[PDB]
Ligand binder design. Sequence first.
Ligand SMILES: CCCCCCCCCCCCCCCCCC(=O)OC[C@H](COP(=O)([O-])OCC(O)COP(=O)([O-])OC[C@@H](COC(=O)CCCCCCCCCCCCCCCCC)OC(=O)CCCCCCCCCCCCCCCCC)OC(=O)CCCCCCCCCCCCCCCCC
Ligand SMILES: CCCCCCCCCCCCCCCCC[C@@H](O)O[C@H](CO[C@H](O)CCCCCCCCCCCCCCC)COP(=O)(O)OCC[N+](C)(C)C
Ligand SMILES: CCCCCCCCCCCCCCCCC[C@@H](O)O[C@H](CO[C@H](O)CCCCCCCCCCCCCCC)COP(=O)(O)OCC[N+](C)(C)C
Ligand SMILES: CCCCCCCCCCCC(=O)SCCNC(=O)CCNC(=O)[C@H](O)C(C)(C)COP(=O)(O)O
Lengths: 88, 52, 56, 178, 69, 175, 459
Amino acid sequence: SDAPPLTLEAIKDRVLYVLKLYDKIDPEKLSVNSHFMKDLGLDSLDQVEIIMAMEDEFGFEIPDIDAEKLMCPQEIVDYIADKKDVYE
Amino acid sequence: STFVAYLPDYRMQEWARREAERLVKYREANGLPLMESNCFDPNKIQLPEDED
Amino acid sequence: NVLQIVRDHWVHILVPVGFVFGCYLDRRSDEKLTAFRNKSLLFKRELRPNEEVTWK
Amino acid sequence: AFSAPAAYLTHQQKVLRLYKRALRHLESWCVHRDKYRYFACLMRARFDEHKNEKDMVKATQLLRQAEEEFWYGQHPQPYIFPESPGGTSYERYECYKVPEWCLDDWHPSEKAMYPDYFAKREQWKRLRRESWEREVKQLQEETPPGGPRTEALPPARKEGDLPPLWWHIVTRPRERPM
Amino acid sequence: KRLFIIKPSGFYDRRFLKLMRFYILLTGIPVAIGITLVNVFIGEAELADIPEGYVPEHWEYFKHPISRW
Amino acid sequence: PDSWDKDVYPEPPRRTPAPAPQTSLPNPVTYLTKIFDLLVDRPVTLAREFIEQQHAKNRYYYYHREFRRVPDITECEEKDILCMFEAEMQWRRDYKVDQEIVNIIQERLKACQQREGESYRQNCAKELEQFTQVSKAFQDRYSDLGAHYSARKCLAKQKQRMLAERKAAKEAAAA
Amino acid sequence: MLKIIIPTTMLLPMTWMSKHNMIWINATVHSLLISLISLSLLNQLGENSLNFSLTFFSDSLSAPLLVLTTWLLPLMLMASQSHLSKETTTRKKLYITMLILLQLFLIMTFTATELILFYILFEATLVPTLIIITRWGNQTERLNAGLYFLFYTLAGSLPLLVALVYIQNTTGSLNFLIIHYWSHPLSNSWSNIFMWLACIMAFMVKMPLYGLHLWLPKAHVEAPIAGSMVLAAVLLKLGGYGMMRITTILNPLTNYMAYPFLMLSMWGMIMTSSICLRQTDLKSLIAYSSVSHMALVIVAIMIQTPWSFMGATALMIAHGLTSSMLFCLANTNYERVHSRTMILARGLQTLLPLMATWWLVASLTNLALPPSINLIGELFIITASFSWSNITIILMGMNMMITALYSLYMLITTQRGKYTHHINNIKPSFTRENALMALHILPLLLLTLNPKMILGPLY
Ligand SMILES: CCCCCCCCCCCCCCCCCC(=O)OC[C@H](COP(=O)([O-])OCC(O)COP(=O)([O-])OC[C@@H](COC(=O)CCCCCCCCCCCCCCCCC)OC(=O)CCCCCCCCCCCCCCCCC)OC(=O)CCCCCCCCCCCCCCCCC
Ligand SMILES: CCCCCCCCCCCCCCCCC[C@@H](O)O[C@H](CO[C@H](O)CCCCCCCCCCCCCCC)COP(=O)(O)OCC[N+](C)(C)C
Ligand SMILES: CCCCCCCCCCCCCCCCC[C@@H](O)O[C@H](CO[C@H](O)CCCCCCCCCCCCCCC)COP(=O)(O)OCC[N+](C)(C)C
Ligand SMILES: CCCCCCCCCCCC(=O)SCCNC(=O)CCNC(=O)[C@H](O)C(C)(C)COP(=O)(O)O
């Protein structure tokens, strides 16, 4: 058929995969609730690059107003799940 | 719709076709022209005497 | 019991009766225009041994 | 699309938006990944060169110059995601979206199939009917006297309240309805 | 999984369509059968010359039985 | 078939060549034609035979209607309404008959063009000549009458044409 | 032809004697039966007309118009009973009485053998229409619409009365057969020019000719649905019928008096088609469509050829059916949302699919898709105009492109897109509305199957 029914666990796994392929973020020190500015010490440009990396991974763009707000991987996963009607 | 489809031929299309077939047959055999420019016999028409 | 049925659905004969009355009046009107019956140069005809008029 | 907008954008917001636009158009120009990475690193270095300018006037002048350069050098046919507002599948599934109120007009024979679904629907409708007045009154309390100044809505705060004006956000048709 | 598909009520349009089909067929199947029976068992007239002394009826100038009737 | 007169609608004697096979291979067209014959043409023929058998048991005739000739519009007084009516009806019938004559000629022309194939420009000269003649005659008789045409307007057109021809002939005589 | 007139006069007391809850049923059934009876008038001759009596005759031009009138009555009855449900019994009977009287006047108008009787009936058709518009319209503009409808008509029709009585004093008769047989040419004098204008302007304003059409959008928008149906389908064709009748005595003066009306018709056809492209009211768009099609009919009548007369007859019948169907389609949405604005209710194909199919078929016939009789008439008129002058194809060509544009604009604006979010009262289509659309559309294609029944006497 078509693509499988994307789930929250898969979304979180892919988000963490992309974030751990980032050279400016240490893998183990990164957690699902880690903040980009406070905990990881990244500036705004790094956040923009992360948002673009998420867009490439899932194949869909995120509006700038919405993109600016997400600060931790939990917010990214929640936004993706709400966008694609993922409930399980 | 059925009634209109089966209305009798009061427009005389087939009658006219058969009459034309008879006329064409008769005129072709005799060597006469198929059709005539004048539909009225000139012998029954009286033109004005003077044209000057 | 047909009393109520008739008093409820007697309005259903007005239009057919009007239709037959109109047919009758059309026949009557045709009856007054026979001044040239069997008299046209195209349709003039000798009568049959039994019939009286060529059309009604 | 989900957040309420603000009265205006800030200078850093404009710089971030220009940075994203320039990166996307450069990726459109640089089809291959390694070349894109090279020129994207160059672009990031160029962006963060003037990061520490304390004169806001010269910062806005540089932003103006950068926007003019972007407009001159943009890709005439940039890559668009298929479901983005210019993509090939932008509004493809909008014709399959049917509002939920249409179910109220189904014939009882149609509703004879799916009994449990309609029982759940009745429960949801009762929930909305019970929560409406509390939502309205909470909005009345939290609204400043001179009317609202933004399009942001307050959440639920009380025992079993619901966030006001939730019915048409929660009961969206779907993204792939049929 | 199997999800519910929200659609407008398709009952009334289908009911109208089947009612229209029923009535049209109800009156048009007998007509088609009658036309076929007439054509098979009562053919069309054959063109012939008027015999001497005979004056045909006005309906005797058409060839199809239904048109003649 | 005998349904139509073959003098009004003539056709050439229909020369077709005999088959001359020059290959050891079979001809698929012949095999397909035999199959089509045995599978389609025979049941249809049997159904037609049954239908004609049923038809022969009920035979009746319809007659072409005959019309006499009445005085033309030239033999009618100026305000005589009845003679004018009969003349107008006869003229309308003749107009219909002339249209059908032109139709027959056009059918001949089209059939010739299809039949002669790649040699139609030379092999259909006679039909084209006949159509040109009939078209010229028909055009003189009825063209430009317009809507609300009548026998009187046709007579006026003919009188005008005769007057012009007489003047042209008399002026050419003086040459 | 009293076998058709008398049953309608019997429809009158049948309605006024019916029970309070059977008026619609009785009226519909007996109207349909009367239409079936009138179907017998299609058996026409090839040379002369059917001369029933000294008073009534049936031609090959008026028989399809009579059939259209008798068929339109039941459709108006079905279309009216929805929005008249809260009305009292007496007023419902009065509404049906108005409709029946309108049908009777129309039936007698198309078969009158004399021009003065034709005038009296063609003018008597005003009172029921004016009463219907000004009494059962919805908005306050209906009063002004009634005034515009009345005075535009009468200011054209009164000089016609003067000219008719003058002609009868001159030639001794107004009987159409005598007029045709004893026709004499019109000289080129100011008296004859003004006689031509008096004999033509009433029918011109009835079509209506461009520049004299301002009454039509008002009257056709402000009327109730049955009023709009009968105004677009039958009452506009009175002008065309009367013009084809009266032009018998106007030759050879027409040869040059037709120029201003021809230029007005062609250019105003372009203008009204363009007006249809920017219209916020859905009913006004259909009204301006009617104006464009009638401009084509005017051109066909003015150039005076057999092909143009055939095209005019076919186009009049086709337009009547198509425009009535379009008005009913718009009225369904109006009854749902109580607004005429076209961009209010959108994406209706999602909510009402079968009604969307009806919309598609109606708008396809509006743009004259072949082999519909709409296109047969339009193509005959275009060929006749091309023979008249080869440069008309440009104007005619522009019109075809524009008509397609605005027809599909209407379709896409109303049916496609996304449904307006706030409108939640769009109930499923009733059986009555679907039957109304089917009874509009099926006769169109059935007539396409046998087109010589609507091609007029010049066939
Ligand atoms: C579903 C509704 C939903 C909504 C939709 C909207 C609906 C709206 C409807 C509104 C109302 C409309 C009513 C219309 C009224 C009009 C009726 C009418 O006038 O009839 C005309 C016409 C009848 O002509 P006629 O003038 O009465 O007869 C003259 C002769 O005398 C006759 O000659 P004959 O002596 O040879 O007799 C022939 C006879 C007998 O013929 C035969 O028996 C021979 C046939 C061949 C068989 C041979 C082989 C088979 C057997 C072999 C094996 C058995 C034998 C051996 C046994 C052993 C086996 C090995 O057949 C007939 O009698 C004709 C058939 C009757 C049809 C009547 C139509 C009435 C319709 C009214 C109802 C309307 C509603 C529809 C409902 C109807 C039901 C669905 O009927 C036809 O339509 C004929 C069409 C068939 C011709 C072939 C097609 C040619 C294709 C060319 C085009 C190619 C391009 C591709 C396009 C293809 C598309 C088709
Ligand atoms: C919902 C699903 C839809 C799709 C499924 C449909 C299934 C198939 C059914 C569709 C039928 C296909 C049509 C194909 C044509 C076949 C019928 C045709 O052959 O009949 C014509 C006949 O058609 C009729 O003549 C036309 C019908 C008349 C229309 C009048 C409408 C009735 C009045 C209604 C109110 C009027 C309003 C308009 C006022 C003017 C032939 O005319 P004609 O060449 O002669 O016949 C020669 C032999 N005769 C003369 C001996 C009979
Ligand atoms: C807004 C839409 C309204 C509807 C449109 C109605 C159309 C009405 C137009 C009338 C068409 C023609 C009318 C008269 C025919 C010829 C017109 C005239 O200009 O031609 C010349 C006329 O010459 C001069 O023009 C004299 C007329 C000048 C006075 C007329 C006033 C025109 C001014 C425009 C006023 C607007 C009129 C419409 C009001 C709304 C021809 O020379 P002549 O051979 O000698 O006259 C022919 C008659 N003869 C043979 C008896 C001698
Ligand atoms: C394909 C062709 C298109 C490419 C053309 C585009 C060319 C443009 C390149 C040059 C433009 C610049 O760099 S213009 C640089 C403008 N400089 C400033 O604004 C100084 C003050 N800094 C801030 O406002 C924030 O710190 C901020 C820097 C926004 C970061 O935000 P965070 O750190 O808080 O995330």
